[PDB]
Amino acid sequence: GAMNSSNYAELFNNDIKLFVDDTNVYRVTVHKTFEGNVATKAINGCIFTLNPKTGHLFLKIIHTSVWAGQKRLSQLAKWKTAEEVSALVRSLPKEEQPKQIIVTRKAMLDPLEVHMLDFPNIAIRPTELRLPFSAAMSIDKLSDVVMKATEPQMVLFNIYDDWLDRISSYTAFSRLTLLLRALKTNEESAKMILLSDPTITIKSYHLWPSFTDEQWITIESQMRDLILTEYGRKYNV
Amino acid sequence: MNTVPFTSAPIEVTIGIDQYSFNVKENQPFHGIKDIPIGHVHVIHFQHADNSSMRYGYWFDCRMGNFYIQYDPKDGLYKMMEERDGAKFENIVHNFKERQMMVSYPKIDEDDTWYNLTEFVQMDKIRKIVRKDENQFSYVDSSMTTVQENELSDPAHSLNYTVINFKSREAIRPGHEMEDFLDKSYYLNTVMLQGIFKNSSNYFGELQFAFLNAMFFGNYGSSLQWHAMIELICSSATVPKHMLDKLDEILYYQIKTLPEQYSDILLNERVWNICLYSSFQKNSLHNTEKIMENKYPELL
Ligand SMILES: O=[N+]([O-])c1cc(Cl)ccc1NCCO
């Protein structure tokens, strides 16, 4: 069934699994028309599909041309997402295919279940976690590749950079979610925290800066303060 | 008009005959039911006074043989049997009629209720859902499970309804996943109607039989099947106009006949609200929607 605080360590066992987040698949800007009506202009999106144990990110760029001439785009987006996830499983060798796919939004369960009927042994599950994967487009290098795309494209990343060389996947995921939660709650402050010190750089083959263990503790502590902060500024406490 | 003679009534029992029912006291001098309209299937059903557990009964068609009921004290139920000796049977019935030991099937002449609930129901098709080929009548009870229920255990004692499953490869064509899941016309028209049922009459017949087993026996699997078959039509954007018009009539009479007090367990709120208010066919069941709103507006 669903995934919550009680079975959290299941994410980091040795059964292959993927999280699917569809929150950035269909992205629009809303604007006024010359007649003073309102219209939307779609922009490129992405499917965020993440192996939480390995950090492997399968970033499917959704080009705005996939919406051309289509109706009910919020509903098509869920099915497009399911189609692309299913095509990804099919493209993987049997021993790399997931045993479970966890969707971050319950509206994805039926579209993915239907696209995966050929894979009856793959469990499709919801979660009760409030995961911050929508903030994936606050990662500059991911946002850049999505915005530059002129056609549909799959780009592969490791969202943990080299962290698993030094920490466990539990810890790596907890750092990732803290960074993403921060970027989601105040993007500017979050980004300031991460880049204030120009001596610490982001390697060309990475997404995040090259922090030492000690610098990560400091960073992690700043992101918590930021999250606690915005929570006060928000509720007045 | 035909007759179903009862050897006797050794245990106190509520007897059902189609949509009618009456009480028989233990060892009351009751020898059966007469004046049963020829031309329709019928169901004769039972609930013992001492154990309302297990409603059970027999679907039958008097044109297919001479049937009588005799209590079995070993198996503890009223059993339908066939009498092959036609002369022995006419002789047995005429004695009980002359002594007036039979209830009369009480058909009011304005009353098409039973016709309207069994219009498409045929004994030959019943016998394929209820497999027991040595008899011409079919036994059903509250606890019998359906073939699809056994998939999710005795197969001989199952209800072999047509399996309908909206998230199945049968229902969903590769490459039309969204299209076929949100508009089930393919599954209704090509897979089920053209493929399996051959025509709408056989479809409506199974639907009508499913309803009747749900209402008369509280057979949960039958209720699931009734709702599935309604939802499949209601969730199809493309349905022949005559099937929609007939579906509206069929359901109207089913809703009209349902006991007012059993609505809470026999009617699936989600299916009905979806069918009447959200589905492609939300504007196509005028009669059914009017009786549902006036009789069970709570459910909606
Ligand atoms: O023959 N019958 O028609 C029949 C009717 C009733 Cl009510 C009782 C017994 C029988 N038959 C006993 C079997 O030979």
Q: What is the DSSP string of chain B?
A: -EEEEBS---S-EEEEETTEEEEE-TT----EEEEEPTTS-EEEEEEESS--S--EEEEE-GGG--EEEEEETTTTEEEEEE---HHHHHHHHHHHHHTT--EEP---TT--HHHHHHTT--HHHHHHHB--TT-SSEEEETTPPBHHHHH---GGGSB-PPP--TTSTTT--TT-HHHHHH-THIIIIIIIIIIIISSHHHHHHHHHHHHHHHHHH--HHHHHHHHHHHHHHHT-S---HHHHHHHHHHHHHHHHHS-GGGHHHHS-HHHHHIIIIISTTTTS-HHHHHHHHHH--TT-
**Domain presence at residue A1:** no
In terms of domains, do A139 and A34 share one? yes
Look up the CATH number of the domain holding residue B174.
Answer: 1.25.40.550
Q: State the residue range of the domain holding A230.
A: 164-237
H/E element holding A154? strand A153-158
CA distance to B14, B17, B21, B173, B223, per residue, from B46 (Å): 6, 9, 9, 45, 19
Query: Which residue, chain included where needed, has tokens 């939004």?
Result: A105
Q: CB burial class (10 A; 0-12, 13-18, 19+) of residue B129?
A: buried
In terms of domains, do A42 and A114 share one? yes
Domain end point (choices A139, A163, A187): A163
Look up the CATH number of the domain holding residue A202.
Answer: 1.20.80.40
State the amino acid at position B86 in one-letter form.
G
**Domain presence at residue A3:** no
Is residue B119 within 8 A of residue B134, CB to CB? The reply is no
**Domain presence at residue A4:** no
Does A119 contact chain B (CB < 8 Å)?
no
Two tokens, residue A235: 């509720």
Residues of B in contact with A110 (CB under 8 A): 167, 181
Does A112 contact chain B (CB < 8 Å)?
no
In terms of domains, do A186 and A153 share one? no
In terms of domains, do A140 and A172 share one? no
Does B169 contact chain A (CB < 8 Å)?
yes
Is residue B266 within 8 A of residue B258, CB to CB? The reply is yes
H/E element holding A124? strand A123-125
Residues of A in contact with B167 (CB under 8 A): 110, 113-114, 117
Is residue B137 within 8 A of residue B80, CB to CB? The reply is yes
CA distance to B226, B249, B282, per residue, from B276 (Å): 15, 14, 4
| Structural biology method used | X-ray
Distance from CA of B147 to the nearest CA of A (A): 20
Whole-angstrom Cα distance, residue A70 to residue B29?
73
DSSP state of A234: H
- B181–A114 C-beta distance less than 8 A: yes
Distance from CA of A170 to the nearest CA of B (A): 35
The closest of B22, B29, B21, B24 to B13, measured between CA atoms, is: B24
In terms of domains, do A187 and A223 share one? yes
Span from the CA of B93 to the centroid of ligand 1 (angstroms): 9
In terms of domains, do A135 and A196 share one? no
Ligand 1 atom 6 nearest Cα: B7
Question: What residues contact A18, with CB distance under 8 A and at least 6 apart?
Answer: A49, A50, A51, A58, A85, A98, A100, A101, A102
Distance from CA of B167 to the nearest CA of A (A): 6
In terms of domains, do A188 and A119 share one? no
Query: Which residue, chain included where needed, has tokens 């750089």?
Result: A201
β-pairing verdict for A100-103 and A123-125: parallel
Ligand 1 atom 9 nearest Cα: B7
Q: Is A155 helix (H, G, I), strand (E, B) or coil?
A: strand
User: What are the beta bridge partners of residue B33?
Assistant: B4, B103
Residues of B in contact with A114 (CB under 8 A): 167, 172, 177-178, 181
In terms of domains, do A135 and A40 share one? yes
End-to-end C-alpha distance for chain B, whole angstroms: 42
Does B172 contact chain A (CB < 8 Å)?
yes
Number of domains chain A is built from: 2
Domain end point (choices A163, A189, A206): A163
- A118–B177 C-beta distance less than 8 A: no
In terms of domains, do A136 and A168 share one? no
Two tokens, residue B153: 């255990």
Ligand 1 closest atom vs CA B92: 3
- As a three-state string, the secondary structure of A17-81 is EEEEECCCCCEEEEEECCCCCEEEEEECEEEEEECCCCCEEEEEEECHHHHCCCCCHHHHHHHHH
Distance from CA of B182 to the nearest CA of A (A): 10
Is residue A102 within 8 A of residue A19, CB to CB? The reply is yes
Q: State the residue range of the domain holding B249.
A: 116-299
In terms of domains, do A58 and A131 share one? yes
**Domain presence at residue A24:** yes
State the amino acid at position B208 in one-letter form.
Q
**Domain presence at residue A2:** no
- A114–B167 C-beta distance less than 8 A: yes
H/E element holding A171? helix A169-185
User: How crowded is residue A184: how many other Cβ atoms within 10 Å of its Cβ?
Assistant: 17
Is residue B144 within 8 A of residue B159, CB to CB? The reply is yes
Span from the CA of A204 to the centroid of ligand 1 (angstroms): 94
Please tell me which of the candidates A76, A83, A114 has its beta carbon nearest to residue B172: A114
The closest of B13, B107, B19, B108 to B69, measured between CA atoms, is: B13
Is residue B200 within 8 A of residue B240, CB to CB? The reply is yes
Does A154 contact chain B (CB < 8 Å)?
no
State the amino acid at position A191 in one-letter form.
K
State the amino acid at position A216 in one-letter form.
W
User: How crowded is residue A198: how many other Cβ atoms within 10 Å of its Cβ?
Assistant: 6
Please tell me which of the candidates A82, A83, A113 has its beta carbon nearest to residue B167: A113
DSSP state of A200: S
Query: What angle in degrees, to the nearest 10, is found between the helix axes of A169-185 and A187-195?
Result: 130
Domain end point (choices A111, A130, A163): A163
Residue B174: closest C-alpha in chain A = A115
β-pairing verdict for B67-72 and A17-21: unpaired
User: How crowded is residue A6: how many other Cβ atoms within 10 Å of its Cβ?
Assistant: 9
CA distance to A8, A9, A78, A177, B260, per residue, from A170 (Å): 9, 8, 29, 11, 57
Span from the CA of B57 to the centroid of ligand 1 (angstroms): 19
Two tokens, residue A187: 């993007």
Whole-angstrom Cα distance, residue A17 to residue A123?
9
The closest of A44, A7, A41, A3 to A20, measured between CA atoms, is: A3
In terms of domains, do A107 and A212 share one? no
In terms of domains, do A146 and A190 share one? no
Q: Select the residue from A74, A117, A122, A124 to test the B interface by mutation, using most B Cβ atoms within 10 A.
A: A117
User: How crowded is residue A94: how many other Cβ atoms within 10 Å of its Cβ?
Assistant: 6
**Domain presence at residue A197:** yes
